[PDB]
Amino acid sequence: GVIDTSAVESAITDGQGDMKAIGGYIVGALVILAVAGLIYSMLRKA
Amino acid sequence: GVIDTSAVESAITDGQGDMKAIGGYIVGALVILAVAGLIYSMLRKA
Amino acid sequence: GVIDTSAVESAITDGQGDMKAIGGYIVGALVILAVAGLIYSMLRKA
Amino acid sequence: GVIDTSAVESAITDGQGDMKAIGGYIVGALVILAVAGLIYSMLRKA
Amino acid sequence: GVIDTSAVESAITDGQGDMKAIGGYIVGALVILAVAGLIYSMLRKA
Amino acid sequence: GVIDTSAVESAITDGQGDMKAIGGYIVGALVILAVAGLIYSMLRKA
Amino acid sequence: GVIDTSAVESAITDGQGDMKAIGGYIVGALVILAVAGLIYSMLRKA
Amino acid sequence: GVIDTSAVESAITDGQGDMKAIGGYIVGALVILAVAGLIYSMLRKA
Amino acid sequence: GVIDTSAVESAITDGQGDMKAIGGYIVGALVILAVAGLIYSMLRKA
Amino acid sequence: GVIDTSAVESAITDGQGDMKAIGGYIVGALVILAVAGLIYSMLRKA
Amino acid sequence: GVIDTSAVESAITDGQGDMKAIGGYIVGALVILAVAGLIYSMLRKA
Amino acid sequence: GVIDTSAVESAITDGQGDMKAIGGYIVGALVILAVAGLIYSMLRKA
Amino acid sequence: GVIDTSAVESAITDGQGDMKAIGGYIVGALVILAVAGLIYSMLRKA
Amino acid sequence: GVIDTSAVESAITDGQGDMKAIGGYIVGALVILAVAGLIYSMLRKA
């Protein structure tokens, strides 16, 4: 479970890499909320 | 208990693999709580 | 005590297998405590 | 100490389960403190 | 030392069971310290 | 060292309990620092 | 049972070496669980 | 199994050293997650 | 080496008890480091 | 693996010290983000 | 290595106590950074 | 191997004491990383 | 097999001492893994 | 070899007692390593 097992594990990390990239949406959620708050503050100042 | 025993043990790990995958819900519980806290912080900032 | 004795020993292990499966509750006790601690940490963060 | 002993151990865990449920108050103590801190922060912001 | 000896050994374990129950105070010492640390963290957050 | 030994150990824990209660001052140090920081923030806001 | 017996024992260890290599999956189970816990902690931090 | 056996064991550790170096990706996973969290926090602050 | 030997062993444990009490300084080293870290965190918060 | 092995390990840490120094860029990423946020706040105030 | 050994160990801790006191500079580094940030915030407010 | 053998073993521990002192660099690695993280946090706060 | 036999046994232990010194690499494997884990934790903290 | 032999054996154990006391340094090696690890953890926390 080291030879073809290592290749299968590498293929699963590359394929399971889609879920980590998608989860990046939740992390960018705080940045989107901060940008929306900054836009609301700029609109209130204007 | 090594010949057909090894095949039975492999079949049980593959079938018992459903419980380990389901338990992944408890592990993703911390990530869901962190995402909810980040969303609440973004809503409070907005 | 090898012929019918081996069959009686196999029947006792299969019947006494219920106590080993039940003891699995104590082992899953640490996992349940870890899940409860993770849920409490997520609630505190939220 | 396996037959009626197992039933006595199961009855003691079910009865001793009251102390584990009560201890849940100490774990919910951190969540209550976090909720009180959030309420104090909201009152200060208001 | 098997007949009345077994009854004397059982009586000594039941009587010596008080020391094992009392020692439970030292084990609950870690839980009390964790509860005190959680209460101090909640007070600091408040 | 179980009979009068247990009573001596219980007396030492009750007497050595003064050091654990005194150490509570270091734990309440974080709460005192948080209260001082909150008072300084309130004075700066005023 | 030393001449052809030694060759038969060597052939059995080489053939029975498949079961030891397969058992390596259970040992790599702890490493996989540690990697999953590290990934969950990184996702919670993000 | 000490003469040419030691050379074969040394060659296997040098060749099996590729799997330990590759596993370094999982260890650097926590550092990558911490860097992503720091970048997200910096973007939210900006 | 059981009569006066037991009294000599008891006297050596009572006299060698000074080294175990002194070693308590190394154990209290972790508590002192934790108290210093808590004081530094409180000073940074203030 | 202690004589020339220690010199080889020291040479690898000195050479592998380039990767730790380079990783310092990710740590200085938070400071750069804080400086950019402070510059943006100063520009908004002006 | 218990008699004069204990005195030598006590002398080394008292002499090696200079390095622990000096390391206190790194711990007071966070307090100095917090004081500098508070002074910069007060200057910006003025 | 007890007379001159003990003196040779003592000389080897004193000479091999250089490797234990050098290994102290890896242990001080965690303290250096913590100091760098504290300096980065202080710079971000400033 | 005691005269020249003892000299041959001493020569074999001195020559076979290379394999024990080389095996020291496997023992230092745990220390290298602990150092790598400490470096990864320091990088994650930074 | 029982009369003056017993006195010679007692004198050899008292004289050979120096090697057992010196070996106490290797046993105290684990305690010294644990104290160094605790000091490093306290420095990292500070």
Swiss-Prot record, chains A, B, C, D, E, F, G, H, I, J, K, L, M, N:
Any single GO CC term annotated in Swiss-Prot or TrEMBL for this entry: host cell membrane
Keyword tags: Capsid protein, Helical capsid protein, Host membrane, Membrane, Signal, Transmembrane, Transmembrane helix, Virion
Membrane-side (Cytoplasmic) residue stretches: 43-46
Membrane topology note: Single-pass type I membrane protein
The keyword Transmembrane helix is assigned to this record: yes
Periplasmic side: 1-21
Residues passing through the membrane, by range: 22-42
Subcellular location: Virion; Host membrane
Family from the record: Belongs to the inovirus capsid protein family.
Assembly information from the UniProt record: Homomultimerizes. There are several thousands of this protein in the phage capsid.
Role, per record: Self assembles to form a helical capsid wrapping up the viral genomic DNA. The capsid displays a filamentous structure with a length of 760-1950 nm and a width of 6-8 nm. The virion assembly and budding take place at the host inner membrane.
Designated name of the protein: Capsid protein G8P
Gene source species: Pseudomonas phage Pf1 (Bacteriophage Pf1)
Encoding gene (name): VIII
Residues of the full protein shown: 37 to 82 of 82
